[PDB]
Amino acid sequence: LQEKNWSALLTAVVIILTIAGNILVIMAVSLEKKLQNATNYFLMSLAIADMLLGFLVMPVSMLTILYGYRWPLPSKLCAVWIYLDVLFSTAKIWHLCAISLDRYVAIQNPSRTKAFLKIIAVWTISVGISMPIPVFGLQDDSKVFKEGSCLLADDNFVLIGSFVSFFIPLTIMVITYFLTIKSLQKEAADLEDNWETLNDNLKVIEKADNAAQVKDALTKMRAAALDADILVGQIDDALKLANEGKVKEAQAAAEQLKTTINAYIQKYGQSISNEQKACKVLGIVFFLFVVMWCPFFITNIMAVICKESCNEDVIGALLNVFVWIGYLNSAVNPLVYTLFNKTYRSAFSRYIQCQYKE
Numbered sequence: 324l325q326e327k328n329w330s331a332l333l334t335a336v337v338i339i340l341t342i343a344g345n346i347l348v349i350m351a352v353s354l355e356k357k358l359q360n361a362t363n364y365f366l367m368s369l370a371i372a373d374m375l376l377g378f379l380v381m382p383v384s385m386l387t388i389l390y391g392y393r394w395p396l397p398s399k400l401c402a403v404w405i406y407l408d409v410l411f412s413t414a415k416i417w418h419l420c421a422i423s424l425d426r427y428v429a430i431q432n433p434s435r436t437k438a439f440l441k442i443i444a445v446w447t448i449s450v451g452i453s454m455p456i457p458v459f460g461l462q463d464d465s466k467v468f469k470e471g472s473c474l475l476a477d478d479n480f481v482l483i484g485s486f487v488s489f490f491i492p493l494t495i496m497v498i499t500y501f502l503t504i505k506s507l508q509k510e511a512a513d514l515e516d517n518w519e520t521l522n523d524n525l526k527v528i529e530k531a532d533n534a535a536q537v538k539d540a541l542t543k544m545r546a547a548a549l550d551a552d553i554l555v556g557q558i559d560d561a562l563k564l565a566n567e568g569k570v571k572e573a574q575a576a577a578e579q580l581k582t583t584i585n586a587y588i589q590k591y592g593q594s595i596s597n598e599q600k601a602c603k604v605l606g607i608v609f610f611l612f613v614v615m616w617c618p619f620f621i622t623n624i625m626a627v628i629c630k631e632s633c634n635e636d637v638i639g640a641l642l643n644v645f646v647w648i649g650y651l652n653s654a655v656n657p658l659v660y661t662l663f664n665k666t667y668r669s670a671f672s673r674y675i676q677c678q679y680k681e
């Protein structure tokens with residue numbers, strides 16, 4: 324029965340922060356026009372997953388702490404509760420994989436509908452992957468009950484579920500995240516190199532005596548312009564003057580290029596610094612999810628490995644606490660957004676003040 328547990332107070336705090344914080348994310352992305360990009364649409368869908376886990380899954384997990392982990396509800400609600408908990412968590416890990424993969428492809432290939440199609444793809448994969456839990460668990464209580472505790476009792480569901488639904492999207496997430504960091508370092512390197520070629524050839528053109536030196540340096544500025552359209556024509560115009568022997572006039576046009584170079588370099592240069600700042604925030608989201616679920620995932624796999632060897636009473640007691648470190652991850656993504664994005668922080672600040680006009 325009640326059993327007077329004190330855990331309820333702590334668990335309720337986690338539930339409220341989860342619900343309130345993730346509502347603030349869904350409100351920020353629905354309302355604030357500066358957050359209408361594909362990454363932030365994935366972060367809204369991830370917040371729905373986190374909100375639904377706070378509403379449907381977490382109160383029932385608190386409820387079972389209050390009955391000594393004797394399952395208080397009707398018995399066929401056990402497999403439905405486990406299904407939802409695995410679904411919302413599987414959908415969290417395939418979303419973070421999807422962001423990581425989509426940001427990587429978006430560098431190499433330079434729509435709201437396209438994002439929504441991928442979001443719905445991620446949910447449909449999560450609903451399908453998690454589907455053996457109620458299909459087999461509702462026909463056999465031995466798979467979802469252990470000593471009248473509702474938990475995923477089938478060892479083979481836990482191994483193959485952990486590998487297929489939690490290890491392979493973790494693998495893809497960590498590879499595409501590392502390759503994204505290498506991509507943006509190469510892009511900032513290539514733009515330092517193009518800046519050096521433009522700046523060296525401006526100094527050659529201003530020292531120049533003859534039409535050969537200006538035509539040589541403007542041709543090499545054109546090649547360097549072709550790595551980072553407006554300048555290419557502006558270069559060609561000066562090249563034509565140099566071709567007809569108008570050296571001084573071509574030199575005048577090169578200083579006219581200088582103003583356009585300072586403009587286009589710093590614009591491309593500030594867009595790389597934005598992407599790397601954004602990658603770092605997503606990396607903290609990614610880092611916290613792996614770390615806060617790590618004690619539960621490995622213990623649950625170590626339970627299966629030392630099945631008769633280990634104190635399964637102790638193991639089960641750790642899994643009951645380690646599931647709450649992972650539930651606490653639902654509360655942190657909104658905080659991360661406040662700490663590292665002015666747009667979220669200001670949006671949240673306004674919504675707490677009940678003020679919804681952008």
Ligand SMILES: COc1ccccc1CCCN1CC[C@H]2[C@@H](C1)c1cccc3c1N2CCN3C
Pocket residue numbers: 405408409412416473474475476481485489616619620623639642643646649
């Ligand atoms: C990335 O996230 C993960 C990584 C690996 C595995 C799972 C997740 C998130 C899903 C967490 N849920 C929590 C509710 C259920 C269920 C797992 C489960 C299976 C076996 C034993 C369980 C439980 N709990 C209840 C306590 N015990 C003893």
Ligand SMILES: CCCCCCCC/C=C\CCCCCCCC(=O)OC[C@H](O)CO
Pocket residue numbers: 632633634635637
């Ligand atoms: C990372 C931590 C590694 C160190 C832990 C290794 C666990 C097994 C060895 C000694 C028990 C140490 C006490 C802590 C765990 C309690 C296990 C226990 O009490 O096991 C007795 C039971 O009767 C058996 O079936």
Ligand SMILES: [Mg+2]
Pocket residue numbers: 519520523
């Ligand atoms: Mg140089």
